[PDB]
């Protein structure tokens, strides 16, 4: 269907403990494929999915080069912004960036993005037209000026439209057997008695990809979320995901309940019962 590539940059200062640490991670869809950590004994851009390992020496040195320039750029960014806000020399501060692109089922540019955050809140973002900026505050406006007078917008658009999309498609082709493949959740229901009168029924979805999924409980055929305990969808560590939803029910009434699971990997919605 539709696809995305995204890069996440984070720079966090540590006054009295060294120079700002810089970390980057790249994603295609829900799949991380690259990483960089300034604190690594030998900082380099490293592969996190089989289908990038094939990239040649010139790729990895170019990426490593880019990340080292990145850490320098964001270090300046932190220092400059720290000046804008006239903050105390005290504690840590953070500068984050997420950028990348969405391509439709046709393989064309749907939307490009490139937004920055300072200390966990929007700071400045490239608007959907890839030509203007939204400054979240007085300081970000100063930055806006600098970027407009430097023509940063055009530079970003050139990459978001061309390079970003091309390579996204490339990675998509190169990793097709996993990126364009959906794994269906393996589902079951567990039984946990609380007392002689109440028991918990937990409905599990394990080993699925992608992350997006839906779990719900029904009584006699009619919903009843408000009574349902979820956990946030979590990563198994094997690139797949997990989730459960539970409901406390009267001992003896287990039959009345059915768990319902919808996921891209299932031909048709599934129905479980204890």
């Amino acid at each position: 269907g539709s696809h995305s590539m995204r890069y996440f940059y984070t720079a966090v200062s540590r006054p009295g403990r060294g120079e700002p640490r810089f970390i980057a991670v790249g994603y295609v869809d829900d799949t991380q494929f690259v990483r960089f950590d300034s604190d690594a004994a030998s900082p380099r851009m490293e592969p996190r999915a089989p289908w990038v390992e094939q990239e040649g020496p010139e790729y990895w040195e170019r990426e490593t080069r880019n990340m080292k320039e990145a850490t320098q750029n964001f270090r300046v960014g932190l220092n400059t912004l720290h000046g804008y806000y006239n903050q105390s020399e005290a504690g840590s501060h953070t500068l984050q960036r997420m950028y990348g692109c969405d391509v439709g089922p046709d393989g064309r540019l749907l939307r490009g993005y490139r937004q920055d955050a300072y200390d966990g809140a929007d700071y400045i973002a490239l608007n959907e037209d890839l030509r203007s900026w939204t400054a979240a505050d007085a300081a970000a406006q100063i930055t806006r000026r600098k970027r407009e007078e430097a023509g940063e917008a055009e530079q970003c658009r050139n990459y978001l439209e061309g390079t970003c999309v091309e390579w996204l498609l490339r990675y998509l082709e190169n990793g097709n057997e996993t990126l364009q493949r959906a794994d269906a959740p393996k589902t079951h229901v567990t039984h946990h008695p609380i007392s002689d009168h109440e028991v918990t029924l937990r409905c599990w979805a394990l080993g699925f990809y992608p992350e997006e999924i839906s779990l719900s409980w029904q009584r006699d055929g009619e919903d009843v979320t408000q009574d349902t305990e979820f956990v946030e969808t979590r990563p198994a560590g094997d690139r797949t995901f997990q989730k459960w939803a539970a409901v406390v029910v009267p001992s003896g009434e287990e039959q009345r309940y059915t768990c319902h699971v919808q996921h891209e990997g299932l031909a048709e919605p599934v129905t479980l019962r204890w």
Binding site: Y7, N73, T80, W167
Partner: peptide, 9 residues
């Protein structure tokens, strides 16, 4: 492929 444009703040 990461982006290699100049940054300003």
């Amino acid at each position: 492929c990461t982006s290699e444009e100049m940054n300003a703040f």
